[PDB]
Structure 1
Amino acid sequence: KLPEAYAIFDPLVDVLPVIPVLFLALAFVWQAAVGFR
């Protein structure tokens, strides 16, 4: 860990990089709310 003063955010930074994947997820929910077409 070398972020110094920002120390505080390891958390959010740690679960951060996954979101690109979760984008795929909404995409299907978007579809569910729109009856799939």
Structure 2
Amino acid sequence: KLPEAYAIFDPLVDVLPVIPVLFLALAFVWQAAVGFR
């Protein structure tokens, strides 16, 4: 487990690893925002 004073932040930690994958997806969003020029 995390140290106890950080336990209230346990859900946020639970979603931290998937953030890099979103970065890849973000690139496509940005390209769609510029029409894939």
Number of residue equivalences: 37
Q: Percent identity?
A: 100
- Structure with greater helix share of residues: 1
TM-score normalised by length of structure 2: 0.85
TM-score normalised by length of structure 1: 0.85
Structure 1 stretches of 5 or more lacking a match?
none
Structure 2 stretches of 5 or more lacking a match?
none
Q: What is the RMSD of the two structures over their aligned residues, measured on CA atoms?
A: 0.9
